[PDB]
Amino acid sequence: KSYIDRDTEYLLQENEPNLSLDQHLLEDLQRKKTDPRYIEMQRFRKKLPSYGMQKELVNLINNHQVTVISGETGCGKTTQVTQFILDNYIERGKGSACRIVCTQPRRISAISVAERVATERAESCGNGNSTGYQIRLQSRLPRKQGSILYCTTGIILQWLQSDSRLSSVSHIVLDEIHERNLQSDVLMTVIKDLLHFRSDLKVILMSATLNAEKFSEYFGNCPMIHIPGFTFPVVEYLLEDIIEKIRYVPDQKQFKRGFMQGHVNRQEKEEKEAIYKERWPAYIKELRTRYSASTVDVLQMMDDDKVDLNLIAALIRYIVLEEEDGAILVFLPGWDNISTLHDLLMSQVMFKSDKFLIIPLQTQVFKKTPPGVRKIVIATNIAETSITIDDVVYVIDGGKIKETHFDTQNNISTMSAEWVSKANAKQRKGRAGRVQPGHCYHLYNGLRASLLDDYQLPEILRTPLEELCLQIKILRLGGIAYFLSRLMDPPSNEAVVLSIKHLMELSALDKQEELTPLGVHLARLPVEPHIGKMILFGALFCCLDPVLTIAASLSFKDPFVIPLGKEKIADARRKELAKETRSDHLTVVNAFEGWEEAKRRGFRYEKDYCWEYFLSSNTLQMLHNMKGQFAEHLLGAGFVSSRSPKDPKANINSDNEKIIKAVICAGLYPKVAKIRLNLKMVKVHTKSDGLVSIHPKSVNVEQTDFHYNWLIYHLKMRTSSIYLYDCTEVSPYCLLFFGGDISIQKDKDQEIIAVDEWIVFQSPERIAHLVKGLRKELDSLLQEKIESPHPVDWDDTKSRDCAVLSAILDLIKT
Numbered sequence: 001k002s003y004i005d006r007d008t009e010y011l012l013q014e015n016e017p018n019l020s021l022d023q024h025l026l027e028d029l030q031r032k033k034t035d036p037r038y039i040e041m042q043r044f045r046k047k048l049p050s051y052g053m054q055k056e057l058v059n060l061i062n063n064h065q066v067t068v069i070s071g072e073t074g075c076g077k078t079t080q081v082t083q084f085i086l087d088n089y090i091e092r093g094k095g096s097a098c099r100i101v102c103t104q105p106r107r108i109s110a111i112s113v114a115e116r117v118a119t120e121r122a123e124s125c126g127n128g129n130s131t132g133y134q135i136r137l138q139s140r141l142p143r144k145q146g147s148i149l150y151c152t153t154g155i156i157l158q159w160l161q162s163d164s165r166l167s168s169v170s171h172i173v174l175d176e177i178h179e180r181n182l183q184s185d186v187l188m189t190v191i192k193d194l195l196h197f198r199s200d201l202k203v204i205l206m207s208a209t210l211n212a213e214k215f216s217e218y219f220g221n222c223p224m225i226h227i228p229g230f231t232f233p234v235v236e237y238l239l240e241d242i243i244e245k246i247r248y249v250p251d252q253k254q255f256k257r258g259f260m261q262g263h264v265n266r267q268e269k270e271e272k273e274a275i276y277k278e279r280w281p282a283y284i285k286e287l288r289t290r291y292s293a294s295t296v297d298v299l300q301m302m303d304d305d306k307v308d309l310n311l312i313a314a315l316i317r318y319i320v321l322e323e324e325d326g327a328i329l330v331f332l333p334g335w336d337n338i339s340t341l342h343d344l345l346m347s348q349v350m351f352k353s354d355k356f357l358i359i360p361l362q363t364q365v366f367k368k369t370p371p372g373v374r375k376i377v378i379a380t381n382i383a384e385t386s387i388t389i390d391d392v393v394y395v396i397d398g399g400k401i402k403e404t405h406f407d408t409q410n411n412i413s414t415m416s417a418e419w420v421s422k423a424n425a426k427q428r429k430g431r432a433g434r435v436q437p438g439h440c441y442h443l444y445n446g447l448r449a450s451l452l453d454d455y456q457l458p459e460i461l462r463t464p465l466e467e468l469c470l471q472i473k474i475l476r477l478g479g480i481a482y483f484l485s486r487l488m489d490p491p492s493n494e495a496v497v498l499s500i501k502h503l504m505e506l507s508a509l510d511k512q513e514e515l516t517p518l519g520v521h522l523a524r525l526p527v528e529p530h531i532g533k534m535i536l537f538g539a540l541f542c543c544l545d546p547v548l549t550i551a552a553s554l555s556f557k558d559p560f561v562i563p564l565g566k567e568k569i570a571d572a573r574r575k576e577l578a579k580e581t582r583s584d585h586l587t588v589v590n591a592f593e594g595w596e597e598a599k600r601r602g603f604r605y606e607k608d609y610c611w612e613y614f615l616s617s618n619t620l621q622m623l624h625n626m627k628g629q630f631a632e633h634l635l636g637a638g639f640v641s642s643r644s645p646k647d648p649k650a651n652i653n654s655d656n657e658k659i660i661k662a663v664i665c666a667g668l669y670p671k672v673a674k675i676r677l678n679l680k681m682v683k684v685h686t687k688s689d690g691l692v693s694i695h696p697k698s699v700n701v702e703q704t705d706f707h708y709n710w711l712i713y714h715l716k717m718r719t720s721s722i723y724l725y726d727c728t729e730v731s732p733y734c735l736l737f738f739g740g741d742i743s744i745q746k747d748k749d750q751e752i753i754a755v756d757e758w759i760v761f762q763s764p765e766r767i768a769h770l771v772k773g774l775r776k777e778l779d780s781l782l783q784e785k786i787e788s789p790h791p792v793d794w795d796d797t798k799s800r801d802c803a804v805l806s807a808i809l810d811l812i813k814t
């Protein structure tokens with residue numbers, strides 16, 4: 001069953017309004033009106049603000065093609081609007097003509113919302129009922145006519161490959177569009193163009209209230225409607241007020257950040273930090289006239305770069321013991337912070353009690369707690385505008401959010417916990433005033449508060465766009481740069497040109513910006529295309545487990561930590577783990593395998609090993625989980641046979657250092673440097689940045705006997721000069737195969753091969769032709785795997801694919 005048809009089953013049904021199903025669903029609506037289950041959920045529904053709007057919203061939808069629906073979080077948009085449309089069609093006898101699709105930002109929301117809406121209809125979710133969901137490679141499909149289907153933006157985008165006009169869908173609901181994810185922004189533009197050819201299509205955009213008229217304006221100033229809600233007053237507290245209220249004092253207990261840990265500072269951030277440090281002395285001074293000396297003493301020493309989870313843990317304990325009843329909701333960045341805080345509470349006997357319910361974001365999150373019991377919900381930033389818990393009275397805003405950024409003049413992109421915007425801070429405050437006067441505790445000081453950005457920039461202006469560029473080409477939307485300029489917030493052309501060029505250097509696009517076979521496969525991997533290249537060749541070459549380890553560390557971070565004052569010995573342990581590999585990436589592999597078998601020897605051995613080698617197990621654990629997700633993507637794309645990164649059949653080459661390094665090269669090219677001849681400092685030539693240095697954290701920073709002239713890297717940083725963060729020595733035959741254009745030059749001395757014209761080394765002419773040939777043979781192998789992809793069988797020795805792949809493997813081991 002071919003890849004372009006996996007989850008197509010709902011879309012490919014034909015919309016035919018059978019007049020007896022029309023009557024059957026009408027007969028069923030009033031039969032439901034007698035089931036106590038249904039009337040009981042109908043009671044909860046009528047107390048939502050959206051219910052009061054019901055027949056005003058359906059009339060707006062019924063009368064216009066494109067509609068924007070505005071409303072505070074919790075008013076009913078996600079769960080009620082699809083129901084309002086189907087029930088209006090059902091009651092009017094037209095119920096079968098109605099095939100509603102509602103898109104969701106995350107796989108989890110598509111499932112949860114479908115199950116909730118189905119519960120509100122006294123039905124099972126899927127299984128031929130009114131409501132269901134479609135995720136990539138997972139389905140609970142509703143009936144074919146008069147149905148609501150919740151899905152992900154990826155599903156729609158894949159659907160467009162099979163039916164660019166989505167002809168069988170009567171209504172499409174774009175939910176949570178204010179989040180401004182890349183895919184949802186591309187979808188909006190594709191749907192706008194589709195309205196011209198689909199006079200019958202209905203399109204409903206659903207947004208939180210801030211900036212919801214921007215979406216109206218983008219759609220030709222289409223009708224807009226706002227579901228009103230009431231918010232009770234919320235007392236806000238800054239870090240000063242919190243520290244004063246609980247007399248916070250930091251506790252009886254420090255590893256290195258920033259440049260040592262691979263963190264570049266963006267210069268647009270540097271301008272506002274200059275305004276912060278310039279205003280800081282006057283702000284402290286005024287604080288000392290209104291807060292206690294100990295409050296200010298503590299405040300001027302708080303770290304701005306990580307949420308103080310110990311402060312949050314203290315504040316929660318103050319709330320539970322000093323404030324009236326009400327659930328508490330915490331907004332943290334990332335699951336690393338959520339589990340740390342959960343364990344901070346759960347280690348204390350006071351919170352092990354039946355009078356507390358502490359939920360990291362779970363069956364019982366919405367259910368109101370008995371008057372004794374206190375609910376504490378620890379959630380990521382995702383619950384700002386998408387999950388609503390009615391019980392909440394106290395909101396703790398950690399003040400931070402995770403967001404990728406892209407540095408266009410140095411082409412380095414990274415992810416970090418940044419300060420929330422004023423808009424986020426106000427949405428978080430609102431969540432506390434939904435049922436009674438609330439309290440919102442903001443974990444930033446007053447000066448920081450005044451210097452927040454008003455809104456977070458859309459992803460389209462911060463992400464790197466390589467993955468998006470592939471999507472545009474796979475949907476045959478035209479010229480990449482031209483199409484992107486039509487988005488509601490077009491990216492900068494510098495970011496577009498960098499992204500296209502990187503894709504060409506990845507060999508995902510050719511010189512005419514057209515997809516290669518490799519690029520097609522990279523489009524089916526929901527990761528950055530350079531990471532997709534690594535993990536794909538980890539599957540083809542059967543070195544999956546160490547490759548996925550390396551891919552995860554590059555995607556997230558390495559597991560090494562550098563406690564302040566222990567630099568000399570931390571680097572001592574790192575290079576011990578290097579083991580003659582001359583590779584920061586293999587070093588993580590060695591540390592990771594040592595960790596897996598340290599934890600198998602007993603968990604006191606695990607704690608010892610992470611401690612003698614300076615590894616954060618919390619980092620290791622998330623790396624492990626990323627490996628399984630990478631595998632699942634390879635499973636869905638047909639390159640691997642099992643969701644397990646340790647499958648023996650995918651790991652026959654997982655101990656061959658040469659092969660592993662060729663795969664690292666596949667993912668990191670064109671980040672290549674030539675090692676300078678030695679006979680002092682270690683420096684290397686780059687294509688354009690000149691002669692640069694090795695980062696002091698790298699296991700190669702003072703390495704004097706390399707065995708090849710070439711290394712690949714992932715991160716270059718600029719402080720006073722340029723530094724390569726993590727580098728790996730590789731053979732010229734790695735670059736020759738996975739690199740750019742190959743050219744031969746000859747004279748009396750020397751047959752040289754040149755790669756991208758500047759990577760130059762001595763090799764016979766025969767190897768250049770042989771590599772050009774194997775590249776073509778690999779293209780055909782990937783091309784033939786485009787329809788119904790299936791993993792390479794390395795147990796069939798006489799396989800043509802095995803013959804070609806074994807030739808490539810033979811070449812890189814040269």
Ligand SMILES: Nc1ncnc2c1ncn2[C@@H]1O[C@H](COP(=O)(O)OP(=O)(O)O)[C@@H](O)[C@H]1O
Nearest residue numbers: 073074075076077078079080116366388389390
């Ligand atoms: N899985 C669920 N179980 C119980 N209640 C839910 C569930 N999902 C949502 N709700 C409740 O339904 C109400 C409407 O939520 P929703 O329609 O998702 O809001 P929004 O307008 O922000 O999209 C909220 O008060 C929420 O608490």
Ligand SMILES: [Mg+2]
Nearest residue numbers: 077078385386
């Ligand atoms: Mg919603």
